[PDB]
Amino acid sequence: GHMKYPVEGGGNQDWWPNRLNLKVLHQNPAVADPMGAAFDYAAEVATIDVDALTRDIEEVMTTSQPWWPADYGHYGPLFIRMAWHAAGTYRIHDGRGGAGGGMQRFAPLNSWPDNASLDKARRLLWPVKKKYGKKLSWADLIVFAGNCALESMGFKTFGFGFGRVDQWEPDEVYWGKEATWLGDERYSGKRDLENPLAAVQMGLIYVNPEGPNGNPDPMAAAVDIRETFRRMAMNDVETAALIVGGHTFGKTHGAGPADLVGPEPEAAPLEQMGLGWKSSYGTGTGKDAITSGIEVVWTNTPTKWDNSFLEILYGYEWELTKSPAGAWQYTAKDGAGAGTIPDPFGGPGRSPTMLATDLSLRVDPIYERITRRWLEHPEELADEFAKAWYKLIHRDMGPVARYLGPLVPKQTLLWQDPVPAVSHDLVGEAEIASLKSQIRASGLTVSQLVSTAWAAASSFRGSDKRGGANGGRIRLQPQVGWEVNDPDGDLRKVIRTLEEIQESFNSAAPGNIKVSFADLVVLGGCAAIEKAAKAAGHNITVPFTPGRTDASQEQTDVESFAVLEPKADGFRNYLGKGNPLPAEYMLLDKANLLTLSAPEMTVLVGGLRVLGANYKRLPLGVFTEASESLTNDFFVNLLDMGITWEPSPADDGTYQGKDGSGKVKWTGSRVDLVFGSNSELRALVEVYGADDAQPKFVQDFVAAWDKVMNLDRFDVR
Amino acid sequence: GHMKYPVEGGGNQDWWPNRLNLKVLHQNPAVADPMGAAFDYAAEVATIDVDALTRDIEEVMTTSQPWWPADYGHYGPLFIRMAWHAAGTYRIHDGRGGAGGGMQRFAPLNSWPDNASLDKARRLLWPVKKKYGKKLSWADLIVFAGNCALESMGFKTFGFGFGRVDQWEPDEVYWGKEATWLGDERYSGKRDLENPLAAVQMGLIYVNPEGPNGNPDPMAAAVDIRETFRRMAMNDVETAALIVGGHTFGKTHGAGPADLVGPEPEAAPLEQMGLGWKSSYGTGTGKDAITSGIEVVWTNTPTKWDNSFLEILYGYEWELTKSPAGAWQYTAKDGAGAGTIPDPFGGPGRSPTMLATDLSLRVDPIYERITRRWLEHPEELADEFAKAWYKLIHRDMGPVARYLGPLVPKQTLLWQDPVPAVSHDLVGEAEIASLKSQIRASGLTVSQLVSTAWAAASSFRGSDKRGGANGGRIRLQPQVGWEVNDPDGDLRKVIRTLEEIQESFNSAAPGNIKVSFADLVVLGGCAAIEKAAKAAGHNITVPFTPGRTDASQEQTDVESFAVLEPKADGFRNYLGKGNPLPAEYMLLDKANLLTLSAPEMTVLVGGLRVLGANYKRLPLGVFTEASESLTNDFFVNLLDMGITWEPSPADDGTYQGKDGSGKVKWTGSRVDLVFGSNSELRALVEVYGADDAQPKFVQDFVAAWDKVMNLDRFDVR
Ligand code: HEM
Ligand code: HEM
Ligand code: NA
DSSP states (O other): OOOOOGGGTOSHHHHSTTOOOGGGGGSSOGGGOOSOTTOOHHHHHTTOOHHHHHHHHHHHHHSOBTTBOOGGGOOHHHHHHHHHHHHTTOOTTTOOOSSTTOGGGSTTGGGOGGGTTHHHHHHHTHHHHHHHGGGSOHHHHHHHHHHHHHHHTTOOOSOOOBOOOOOSSOOOOOOOSOSSTTOOOOEETTTEEOTTOOSSSTTOSSSOTTSGGGOOOHHHHHHHHHHHHHHTTOOHHHHHHHHHHHHTSOOOOBOSOGGGBOOOGGGSOGGGTTOOOOBOSTTSSGGGOBSSSOOOOOOSOTTSOSSHHHHHHHHSOEEEEEOTTSOEEEEEGGGTTTTOBOOTTSOOOBOOEEOHHHHHHHHSHHHHHHHHHHHHOHHHHHHHHHHHHHHHHHGGGOSGGGOBSTTOOOOOOGGGOOOOOOOSBOOOHHHHHHHHHHHHHTTOOHHHHHHHHHHHHTTOBTTTTBOSSTTOTTSSTTGGGOGGGOIIIIIHHHHHHHHHHHHHHHHTOSSSBOOOHHHHHHHHHHHHHHHHHHTTTOOOOOOOOOOOOOOOGGGSOHHHHGGGSOSEEGGGTEEOTTOSSOHHHHHHHHHHHTTOOHHHHHHHHHHHHHHTOSGGGOOTTOOOSSSSOOOSHHHHHHTOTTOEEEEOTTOSSEEEEEOTTSOEEEEEEHHHHHHHHSHHHHHHHHHHTSGGGHHHHHHHHHHHHHHHHTTTOGGGO | OOOOOGGGTOSGGGTSTTOOOGGGGGOSOGGGOOSOTTOOHHHHHTTOOHHHHHHHHHHHHTOOBTTBOOGGGOOHHHHHHHHHHHHHTOOTTTOOOSSTTOGGGSTTGGGOGGGTTHHHHHHHTHHHHHHHGGGSOHHHHHHHHHHHHHHHTTOOOSOOOBOOOOOSSOOOOOOOSOSSTTOOOOEETTTEEOTTOOSSSTTOSSSOTTSGGGOOOHHHHHHHHHHHHHTTTOOHHHHHHHHHHHHTSOBOOBSSOGGGBOOOGGGSOGGGTTOOOOBOSTTSSGGGOBSSSOOOBOOSOTTSOSSHHHHHHHHSOEEEEEOTTOOEEEEESTTTTTTOBOOSSSOOOBOOEEOHHHHHHHHSHHHHHHHHHHHHOHHHHHHHHHHHHHHHHHTTSOSGGGOBSTTOOOOOOGGGOOOOOOOSBOOOHHHHHHHHHHHHTSSOOHHHHHHHHHHHHTTOBTTTTBOOSTBOGGGSTTGGGOGGGOOSSHHHHHHHHHHHHHHHHHTTOSTTBOOOHHHHHHHHHHHHHHHHHHHTTOOOOOOOOOOOOBOOGGGSOTTGGGGGSOSEEGGGTEEOSOOSSOHHHHHHHHHHHTTOOHHHHHHHHHHHHHHTOSGGGOOTTOOOSOSSOOOSHHHHHHTOTTOEEEEOTTOSSEEEEEOTTSOEEEEEEHHHHHHHHSHHHHHHHHHHTSGGGHHHHHHHHHHHHHHHHTTTOGGGO
């Protein structure tokens, strides 16, 4: 296996195939962003005429282009699938995927077999992107196209928020271990899906339209649908509503032999201008179009919202049959309803058809009773579908503060992990300063304070922008019993103490100024850091931005927050069972979810060790003589060639480091020692380990600490 | 075959193995740099105490550490090998490798077979880096430790320049296609080494120390020595000076069998802390050290400069033997010189040895002539080694303005491609205005003025920082005769006119203001771009930094400049024969060498095309109807779905774009069409092709043009 020039993908991974890849800590570099550092997309979208935009999208939807002719003269349904697939890569195990970065226009998603024909779909929208320019991201435009198509065709959606900022480089995400398109190496037992995957095969959105592994058993397919949709945050009602609403519109495309469909866009030749799946069957487009291979028109009104889907589904009995491309699909028994389903280009009427996965909605007991109801109550269908469609298209949006434009309903939605609004006034400097002092007198150790503060804010993941310290959800279930949060010890005692100063400041409130318990957690860790820095000769002040609000168990979907629990957090030297990769890979992964740079992770790890942030106050990595002092000691001692490291006898994944006398002087995890072993981390360590580095380490530690405290704070930026 | 987590190296390269890798246009991104944005290494080293730095380095050289005890109680020889290997990766074909970025501390170079034991060498100097911190780069220290080692042991070096800026991410370089260490797949013809390479095997600095492919034949080895050292800028005299002066010091290491040496640093377990090649042979170090597996001590004075090496080489007859690890070496015949050679740790005394490649200096007719002369006149050896070591340790520093500190010698060196000092007052704003207008009245076209300026300035490559518009070498051999600069017609016409303008301005200037030819070439293109921006309805002024001076032919080494000749320049739609990859990979490589970002690269192609910069003024990519006009027409038309693109029937690497009538409207190359085809590049094209994009396009194109004109201008930086 030969080596390639860098410009062809060659590099150090070819020589050391499973080495730590720090490039996950500089995804989307700024060198590669064509917009200024000063580019402010929020400011840009504020200026967008949404009616004009909707109109222009309306014109695109009904102007057929010769190079991909519009089914029934309306691109609407294509655009809805496009939007549904854009959002449809989301997964709750890491919150990756989804439509929020517009990743569908980049590798690999732009070439997934399930995203076939969406190269022409996105391409049709260029006249729009061309007219609105920097005021409209592709990311906004792709889902807003779907939303408009829904409206254009008779369905009133719940609303839309703009604000997805375009990126310039594909998000690097694990979609599975299979090196084959459509491959399946992800299951175990009886249909246990490999975490963190939410699809049944490589390059599928959710499930196989011909049933699992091509076996068109609607009862079996429902097992997959239920499971994959639940990993994309949709329960049974949401799932059934979404499918019915989706397949109320448009058509599948499978007019001929699929071996006449050329390479996917990333592999296609240059003259195809980013498009792929060029096809030699017929005209290759329109009446001859091939996409999935299936040939199904679910309803007789493919460009109108009505209840056809559930009437056809229940009004006929279903025979297994074959598309013109050898794909399993269902059609009506007894030749019933001949010629009732209209042809996309004026040809003869056809018979009713369904997908294997559509019949699941009628065969599976839980789905059957949900959809039978909607057969006699379409207003309920229309309602649960709007709520679910809105949720689908905004899952990765983050806190509601991020939603932009004139189309965001004010209504509270529990799935957004809602936070009460700032009601009273906000603590100013004098007040802030005071409360640092009381917190310092609380009797809470720097270890207690810092570790609790880190526990709240570090709950944030930049993938879907959930979690974080706003909400005060650390004192609520489930966060309060998380083994990493070690409720066992002082989580309660710190919670209980910290609410006391909430009251004491509030019960003796000067006027209208109040403090949330969510803020005291963050102010606590802040003030402790100030203390531990003065203990080390440095008088400094840690920034603190108020405005967080408390929140009740009632506004905290316990099972939704389950997925935000760390199975590992190197910054506290915690490693639970079940992790997919050694502890140093989980370190980097956690830092990527925290939006941290490689230098930021480094200074954070070093700082937190010497402060006591370790899970169960363990000594691993605590390379300092001093107690609760803010030194660069961790870096200095890591570089001390006087220490010899050897794996612990007990196979803990612990190491001992001995001095000259052979006495054990230090212990550490793999997480600790990777900074001395990895050639690129040790470079950073050596920056912060030098004689002239103590003030810079502190300065950089604070700025990165303040960065984690502020991760979820879109209300103030 | 299996897909891996991005943190373990997964990505889109795995699905599309030979795809363009735009990550080459954001090497070493700011987010991964731990210093602030205000950091200026030049400012920091400028204030180092060199005298104290030297004493501390001398202190380390004579202070043996138990984990790698010092041969003869002196690390000096080990540090010379380290400096020579750091600089020794340099190759002329593309200017890459060398010591300039301190890449030896990063993969793959820190794990090269030829760099075994250097892991400990670099480790030994942490006490020096630790002490000076951000005043002293690893790059500067690594090569300075070797220079200090030389003077410590009796050799007065010529001087030394600080200024190598440390990096944080391995420079990705093509070192060959061999996926096996020490593999050889790089010769065709009769012993022709593949370009750009300059080593005979993968992970060698230059040549195999046991002769070609381990055939210990001095005469044949010599042919490799000659050719690799030539591709590293060293002629016969410099090469022999280097090998003699080098092996005047220290010893090789092979006390035991080589399969007792553990994995190289990047494959070594965490506890080894970046050190590799753990040896289970004896103590694994010191008297037992195994680096190369050869066990030669050259001189009887390993820690002192003298003429012992050539005295030993010529005072004995040599015969082939095996080291304790079974490697080929030579030893004296007839048990002569037994015991005359000291052991590194106490030791019984041993008899003369040389490497096969050392005998080449005596067996090869050219080298023998040189080395005999120095046997009889060793003062001459001292001089040539001083010049050649200085060249070696500084070959990639770039212009002499980058050399910092009190040890920088003042003499001009032809190999530095020198440039005259500014002799007069430089042009101010009024002179620059007047001269711009004189250029616009001259008769030279926008096309001629932009082409000339681009040809001069784009000769810079940021690898070794050679070339550029300063020096005015576009009017000298060889640049004036390069095919891409197409001297059959306009270039000499252009040169004459700018000289006439320079003469007439200088002979009438105010006070003592004078202007160089070199400045007028760049000024000319700046003036052309303002005129064309105006024709497109923009009133921009293109910045301009005076202060280039005019080299003479005598200060211009014709042969040394040959490696700078472009065999591909996508910015001019030029593609010669003999490039390693297709045209679009060469475009990126050219952008990389110019230090351009993907957005900067995209804006320049767009601008250069409509401006007329194309080699031979061909229409490929000239997607505009306007002459001499700086519009964004290239991106607008590239994105025009009304054009249909097919490969030209003449199979000539061009393409035809037809509109609706079926008439050929545009033509283009792989370089043009890759901006409409690559999904990352098309994203950038969509920014600059929007309706609102045209002022942003002019602004960024001007900024990138300015960056390119100033690439070599370290005299103002
Ligand atoms: C178990 C869940 C689902 C399965 C198995 C599935 C599968 C499919 C398949 C195979 C096609 C054929 C594509 C082609 O050949 O053109 C299709 C089309 C379509 N899908 Fe679904 N999908 C699912 C869920 C959804 C959802 C949740 C939505 C929207 C909320 C949706 C909206 C659409 C639309 C509008 C089309 C027609 C596109 C057009 O007319 O060109 N689907 N679906
Ligand atoms: C034909 C080119 C050369 C070859 C084949 C060659 C080969 C070698 C080899 C095999 C070693 C022993 C490695 C070990 O086990 O430690 C060695 C050592 C050394 N080489 Fe070279 N070398 C060459 C040129 C140079 C040059 C240009 C220099 C410096 C100017 C140099 C300086 C040294 C030094 C100082 C050592 C001593 C290492 C120590 O004392 O620890 N060599 N060389
Ligand atoms: Na319908």
